[PDB]
CSV table of C-alpha atoms and ligand atoms in Angstrom, one decimal:
chain,number,residue,atom,x,y,z
M,1,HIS,CA,20.9,2.1,9.5
M,2,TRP,CA,17.4,3.0,8.7
M,3,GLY,CA,14.1,1.8,11.0
M,4,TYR,CA,11.4,3.2,12.1
M,5,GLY,CA,12.8,6.0,14.4
M,6,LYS,CA,12.3,10.1,14.8
M,7,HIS,CA,15.9,10.0,13.6
M,8,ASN,CA,16.2,7.0,10.7
M,9,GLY,CA,12.3,6.3,9.9
M,10,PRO,CA,10.8,6.7,6.6
M,11,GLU,CA,10.9,10.4,6.7
M,12,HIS,CA,14.7,9.8,5.8
M,13,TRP,CA,15.0,6.3,4.0
M,14,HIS,CA,14.6,8.3,0.2
M,15,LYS,CA,18.5,9.3,0.9
M,16,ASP,CA,19.8,5.7,0.5
M,17,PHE,CA,16.9,4.2,-0.8
M,18,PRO,CA,15.7,7.3,-3.6
M,19,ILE,CA,13.4,4.7,-5.0
M,20,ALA,CA,11.0,5.8,-1.9
M,21,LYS,CA,9.8,8.6,-3.8
M,22,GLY,CA,9.2,6.0,-6.9
M,23,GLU,CA,5.9,5.8,-8.9
M,24,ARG,CA,4.8,2.3,-7.0
M,25,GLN,CA,4.9,2.8,-3.4
M,26,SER,CA,3.6,0.5,-0.8
M,27,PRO,CA,1.4,1.2,1.3
M,28,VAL,CA,-1.5,2.8,0.6
M,29,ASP,CA,-4.9,4.4,1.8
M,30,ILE,CA,-7.7,2.2,-0.1
M,31,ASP,CA,-10.6,4.0,-0.8
M,32,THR,CA,-12.9,1.8,-1.0
M,33,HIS,CA,-15.3,4.0,-3.0
M,34,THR,CA,-12.8,5.0,-5.6
M,35,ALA,CA,-11.6,1.2,-6.2
M,36,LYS,CA,-13.2,-0.2,-8.7
M,37,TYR,CA,-14.9,-3.6,-8.4
M,38,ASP,CA,-13.0,-6.0,-11.6
M,39,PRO,CA,-16.0,-9.1,-12.7
M,40,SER,CA,-12.9,-10.5,-14.6
M,41,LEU,CA,-10.9,-11.2,-11.2
M,42,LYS,CA,-10.6,-14.1,-10.1
M,43,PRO,CA,-10.9,-16.4,-7.2
M,44,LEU,CA,-7.5,-16.1,-4.8
M,45,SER,CA,-6.1,-19.9,-4.6
M,46,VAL,CA,-4.4,-20.3,-1.1
M,47,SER,CA,-2.4,-23.8,-0.8
M,48,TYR,CA,-1.7,-23.3,2.7
M,49,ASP,CA,-2.2,-27.2,3.2
M,50,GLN,CA,1.9,-28.8,2.6
M,51,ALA,CA,3.4,-25.4,4.5
M,52,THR,CA,6.2,-26.5,6.0
M,53,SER,CA,7.3,-23.7,8.9
M,54,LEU,CA,11.1,-23.5,10.2
M,55,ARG,CA,12.2,-20.8,12.8
M,56,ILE,CA,11.6,-17.8,13.9
M,57,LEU,CA,13.5,-14.7,13.8
M,58,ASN,CA,13.7,-11.3,15.5
M,59,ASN,CA,15.5,-9.2,12.3
M,60,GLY,CA,15.4,-5.8,14.8
M,61,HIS,CA,12.6,-4.3,12.4
M,62,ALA,CA,9.9,-7.1,12.6
M,63,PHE,CA,9.6,-10.7,13.5
M,64,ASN,CA,9.9,-13.5,10.7
M,65,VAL,CA,8.1,-16.5,10.5
M,66,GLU,CA,10.3,-18.3,7.6
M,67,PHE,CA,8.9,-21.4,5.9
M,68,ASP,CA,10.8,-24.0,3.5
M,69,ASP,CA,10.5,-22.7,-0.2
M,70,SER,CA,12.6,-25.0,-2.0
M,71,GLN,CA,9.5,-27.2,-3.2
M,72,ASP,CA,5.9,-26.0,-4.1
M,73,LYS,CA,4.7,-26.9,-0.5
M,74,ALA,CA,2.9,-23.6,0.6
M,75,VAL,CA,1.7,-21.6,-2.6
M,76,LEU,CA,-0.3,-18.2,-3.7
M,77,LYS,CA,-2.1,-18.8,-7.3
M,78,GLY,CA,-5.4,-16.9,-9.1
M,79,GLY,CA,-6.6,-13.4,-8.4
M,80,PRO,CA,-4.7,-11.3,-9.9
M,81,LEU,CA,-2.3,-13.4,-10.2
M,82,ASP,CA,-0.7,-14.9,-13.7
M,83,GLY,CA,1.8,-18.0,-12.0
M,84,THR,CA,2.9,-19.8,-8.8
M,85,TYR,CA,3.9,-18.0,-6.4
M,86,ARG,CA,5.3,-19.5,-2.7
M,87,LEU,CA,5.5,-18.5,0.4
M,88,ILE,CA,8.7,-17.6,2.1
M,89,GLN,CA,8.0,-16.0,5.5
M,90,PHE,CA,4.9,-13.6,7.5
M,91,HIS,CA,5.5,-10.8,9.8
M,92,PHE,CA,3.2,-8.1,10.6
M,93,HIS,CA,3.7,-4.9,11.4
M,94,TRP,CA,2.0,-2.9,14.6
M,95,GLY,CA,1.4,-0.1,16.7
M,96,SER,CA,2.1,1.5,20.5
M,97,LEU,CA,-1.8,2.0,20.4
M,98,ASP,CA,-4.6,0.1,18.8
M,99,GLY,CA,-5.2,2.9,16.7
M,100,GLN,CA,-2.5,2.5,14.4
M,101,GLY,CA,-0.3,-0.2,13.0
M,102,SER,CA,-1.1,-0.9,9.9
M,103,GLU,CA,0.6,-0.4,7.1
M,104,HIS,CA,-2.1,0.0,4.3
M,105,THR,CA,-5.4,1.9,6.0
M,106,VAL,CA,-9.2,1.4,4.9
M,107,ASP,CA,-11.2,5.0,4.2
M,108,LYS,CA,-7.8,6.2,6.1
M,109,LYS,CA,-8.8,3.8,8.7
M,110,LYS,CA,-5.9,2.5,10.2
M,111,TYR,CA,-5.7,-0.6,12.1
M,112,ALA,CA,-3.7,-2.2,14.9
M,113,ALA,CA,-1.3,-4.3,12.9
M,114,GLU,CA,-1.1,-5.8,9.5
M,115,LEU,CA,0.1,-9.0,8.6
M,116,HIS,CA,2.1,-9.6,5.3
M,117,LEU,CA,2.3,-13.5,4.1
M,118,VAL,CA,5.2,-12.9,1.9
M,119,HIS,CA,5.5,-14.6,-0.9
M,120,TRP,CA,7.7,-14.9,-4.7
M,121,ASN,CA,7.2,-16.1,-8.0
M,122,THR,CA,8.8,-19.6,-9.0
M,123,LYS,CA,9.5,-18.2,-12.3
M,124,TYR,CA,12.4,-16.5,-11.3
M,125,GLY,CA,14.1,-19.3,-9.2
M,126,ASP,CA,14.9,-17.6,-6.0
M,127,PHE,CA,13.7,-15.0,-3.9
M,128,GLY,CA,16.5,-12.5,-4.7
M,129,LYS,CA,16.0,-12.5,-8.3
M,130,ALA,CA,12.4,-12.0,-8.0
M,131,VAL,CA,12.6,-8.9,-5.7
M,132,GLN,CA,14.2,-7.2,-8.7
M,133,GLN,CA,11.6,-8.0,-10.9
M,134,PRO,CA,8.3,-6.2,-11.4
M,135,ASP,CA,6.0,-9.0,-11.4
M,136,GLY,CA,8.6,-10.9,-8.4
M,137,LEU,CA,6.2,-10.7,-5.4
M,138,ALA,CA,3.0,-11.2,-4.2
M,139,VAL,CA,2.2,-10.2,-0.5
M,140,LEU,CA,-1.2,-11.1,1.1
M,141,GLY,CA,-2.2,-8.5,3.2
M,142,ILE,CA,-4.1,-9.1,6.9
M,143,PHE,CA,-5.6,-6.4,8.8
M,144,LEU,CA,-5.6,-7.5,12.9
M,145,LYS,CA,-8.5,-5.4,14.7
M,146,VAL,CA,-8.6,-5.8,18.4
M,147,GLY,CA,-11.1,-8.2,19.7
M,148,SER,CA,-11.0,-11.6,20.2
M,149,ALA,CA,-8.4,-14.0,20.3
M,150,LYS,CA,-7.0,-15.2,17.2
M,151,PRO,CA,-6.5,-19.4,18.2
M,152,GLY,CA,-4.5,-19.3,15.0
M,153,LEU,CA,-1.9,-17.0,16.2
M,154,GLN,CA,-1.4,-17.7,19.4
M,155,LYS,CA,1.5,-20.3,19.2
M,156,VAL,CA,3.6,-17.1,18.1
M,157,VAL,CA,2.4,-14.9,20.6
M,158,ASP,CA,3.9,-17.5,22.9
M,159,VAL,CA,7.1,-18.2,21.7
M,160,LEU,CA,8.0,-14.1,21.6
M,161,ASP,CA,9.9,-14.5,25.1
M,162,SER,CA,12.7,-16.3,23.3
M,163,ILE,CA,13.1,-14.0,20.6
M,164,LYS,CA,12.8,-10.7,22.7
M,165,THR,CA,16.0,-9.2,21.1
M,166,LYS,CA,17.2,-8.4,18.1
M,167,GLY,CA,19.3,-11.7,16.3
M,168,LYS,CA,17.1,-14.1,18.2
M,169,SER,CA,16.1,-16.8,17.0
M,170,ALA,CA,13.6,-20.1,17.5
M,171,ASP,CA,12.5,-23.2,15.8
M,172,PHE,CA,9.0,-22.7,14.9
M,173,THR,CA,8.1,-26.1,12.8
M,174,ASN,CA,4.6,-27.8,12.4
M,175,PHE,CA,2.9,-24.1,12.5
M,176,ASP,CA,-0.3,-23.9,10.3
M,177,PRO,CA,-0.7,-20.9,8.8
M,178,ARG,CA,-4.3,-21.1,7.0
M,179,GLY,CA,-4.9,-20.7,11.3
M,180,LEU,CA,-4.3,-16.9,10.7
M,181,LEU,CA,-6.8,-16.3,7.5
M,182,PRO,CA,-10.1,-14.4,7.9
M,183,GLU,CA,-13.2,-16.6,6.8
M,184,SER,CA,-13.5,-14.5,3.2
M,185,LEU,CA,-10.9,-14.2,0.7
M,186,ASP,CA,-12.5,-10.7,-0.9
M,187,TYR,CA,-9.7,-8.1,-1.4
M,188,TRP,CA,-8.3,-5.3,-3.3
M,189,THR,CA,-5.0,-4.9,-5.3
M,190,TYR,CA,-2.6,-3.2,-7.0
M,191,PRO,CA,1.0,-3.0,-7.9
M,192,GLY,CA,3.1,-1.4,-5.5
M,193,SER,CA,6.6,-1.9,-3.5
M,194,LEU,CA,8.0,-3.4,-0.8
M,195,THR,CA,7.3,-1.4,2.4
M,196,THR,CA,10.7,-1.5,4.2
M,197,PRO,CA,14.3,-0.7,2.1
M,198,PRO,CA,14.9,-1.2,-0.5
M,199,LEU,CA,11.1,-0.2,-0.8
M,200,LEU,CA,12.0,-2.2,-4.5
M,201,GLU,CA,9.1,-2.5,-6.8
M,202,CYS,CA,8.1,-6.0,-7.1
M,203,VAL,CA,5.0,-6.7,-5.4
M,204,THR,CA,1.8,-7.4,-5.9
M,205,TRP,CA,-0.4,-6.1,-3.3
M,206,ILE,CA,-3.6,-8.4,-2.4
M,207,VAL,CA,-5.0,-7.1,1.0
M,208,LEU,CA,-7.7,-9.2,2.2
M,209,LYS,CA,-11.2,-7.4,2.7
M,210,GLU,CA,-12.2,-9.1,6.2
M,211,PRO,CA,-9.5,-8.6,9.3
M,212,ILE,CA,-9.1,-10.5,11.5
M,213,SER,CA,-9.7,-10.1,15.1
M,214,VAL,CA,-7.0,-10.7,17.4
M,215,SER,CA,-7.5,-10.2,21.6
M,216,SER,CA,-5.3,-7.1,23.1
M,217,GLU,CA,-3.3,-9.6,25.2
M,218,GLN,CA,-2.5,-10.9,21.9
M,219,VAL,CA,-1.0,-7.5,20.2
M,220,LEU,CA,0.3,-6.2,23.4
M,221,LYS,CA,3.0,-9.0,23.7
M,222,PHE,CA,4.1,-7.9,20.5
M,223,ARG,CA,4.8,-4.8,21.8
M,224,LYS,CA,7.1,-6.2,24.3
M,225,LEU,CA,10.1,-7.4,21.8
M,226,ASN,CA,12.8,-4.9,21.4
M,227,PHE,CA,14.6,-3.5,18.3
M,228,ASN,CA,18.3,-3.8,20.1
M,229,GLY,CA,20.3,-6.1,20.6
M,230,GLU,CA,20.6,-7.8,24.0
M,231,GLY,CA,22.6,-6.0,26.1
M,232,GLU,CA,22.0,-2.9,24.4
M,233,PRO,CA,19.7,-0.4,25.9
M,234,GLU,CA,15.8,-1.2,25.7
M,235,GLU,CA,13.4,0.4,22.6
M,236,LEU,CA,10.2,-2.1,22.3
M,237,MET,CA,9.7,-2.8,18.6
M,238,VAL,CA,6.6,-0.4,17.9
M,239,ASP,CA,5.2,1.6,15.4
M,240,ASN,CA,7.0,-0.3,13.2
M,241,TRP,CA,4.8,0.5,10.0
M,242,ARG,CA,5.7,3.0,7.0
M,243,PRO,CA,2.4,5.5,6.6
M,244,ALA,CA,0.7,5.3,3.5
M,245,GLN,CA,2.1,7.6,0.1
M,246,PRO,CA,1.0,8.5,-2.9
M,247,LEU,CA,-1.3,6.5,-4.9
M,248,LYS,CA,-0.1,8.5,-8.2
M,249,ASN,CA,-0.9,6.5,-11.5
M,250,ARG,CA,-2.3,3.4,-9.7
M,251,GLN,CA,-5.8,1.9,-9.8
M,252,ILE,CA,-7.1,-0.4,-6.5
M,253,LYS,CA,-9.0,-3.3,-7.6
M,254,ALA,CA,-11.8,-5.5,-5.9
M,255,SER,CA,-12.7,-8.6,-6.2
M,256,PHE,CA,-16.0,-7.8,-4.7
M,257,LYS,CA,-19.0,-5.3,-5.0
J,1,72G,C1,12.5,-9.7,3.6
J,1,72G,C2,13.4,-10.3,3.0
J,1,72G,C3,14.1,-11.8,3.8
J,1,72G,O1,13.1,-12.7,4.2
J,1,72G,C4,14.7,-9.8,2.6
J,1,72G,C5,14.3,-8.2,1.7
J,1,72G,C6,13.6,-7.9,1.6
J,1,72G,C7,12.4,-8.4,2.7
J,1,72G,C8,11.2,-8.1,2.3
J,1,72G,C9,10.0,-8.5,2.6
J,1,72G,C10,8.9,-8.1,2.6
J,1,72G,C11,8.7,-6.6,2.4
J,1,72G,S1,6.6,-5.8,2.8
J,1,72G,N1,6.8,-4.9,4.6
J,1,72G,O2,6.4,-7.0,3.2
J,1,72G,O3,6.2,-5.4,1.9
J,1,72G,C12,9.9,-5.8,3.3
J,1,72G,C13,10.9,-6.4,3.0
J,2,72G,N1,18.6,3.9,5.6
J,2,72G,S1,18.3,6.4,5.6
J,2,72G,O1,17.0,6.1,6.3
J,2,72G,O2,18.7,7.0,5.3
J,2,72G,C1,19.6,6.5,7.5
J,2,72G,C2,20.5,5.8,8.0
J,2,72G,C3,21.5,6.5,9.0
J,2,72G,C4,21.1,7.1,9.4
J,2,72G,C5,21.9,7.1,11.1
J,2,72G,C6,23.8,7.2,10.8
J,2,72G,C7,24.0,7.4,12.0
J,2,72G,C8,23.7,7.8,12.6
J,2,72G,C9,22.4,8.5,13.0
J,2,72G,C10,22.0,9.1,14.1
J,2,72G,O3,20.4,9.4,14.0
J,2,72G,C11,21.3,7.9,12.1
J,2,72G,C12,20.2,7.5,9.5
J,2,72G,C13,19.1,7.2,8.0
J,3,ZN,ZN1,5.3,-5.8,5.5
């Protein structure tokens, strides 16, 4: 089916997901000189103190760390958002080389990877309903640059050997996602979409200004994962990113000057 190869990648997706050519597609390039500071944007409220991680899964496109979203345990509020968004999972997109891998770009700069913390608007009851709504999701996006190691990422790196191939999962309880954040919560925000099929236009994107630093060894271990299932020819899971899409009739707002 769809993927990231030459024969099933982002240039092909529109044939089965025509919204790929829609009016609010993600990711986008963040032109920092064209984004407008909005002094009415509130601070983000990230409340992960009670987060309950469950499992890590290689789904053939990335790996997801999944959370208990049956109660308000780990929630995102504030910023541009109305209402409460529950954390359901996080995942990454990354490159084959340190100079590429992020989906969003900043003044056309690509980061080595991008973390997506996916939340859904609790007024819609469940995630499947939320993705059908224009304000159903809020994804907190965080850039990764290669430099010093991120201690809060190491527990994720440690377990990747056990989920090398598509369909493999492992217990991943008691993981604190607060260890994945930068110091500052300054952000850009704009209305967009899922960056993989079904490409639904349901996401308020909140992209942090400050990248996190991860070590070359940490991202190298990302690149040892496999797109393929066990017993199939090995295809390294690398370059699972969609390139920047036309901004069209949208304005990116900044919470900071
Ligand atoms: C995730 C699930 C299940 O966890 C189901 C359908 C779609 C997605 C999805 C979530 C987030 C994104 S992203 N790259 O954060 O925009 C793409 C697909
Ligand atoms: N969902 S999509 O991006 O439009 C898509 C789905 C399936 C294919 C496909 C199907 C069968 C064989 C091949 C081999 O290249 C590719 C190629 C593209
Ligand atoms: Zn993503």
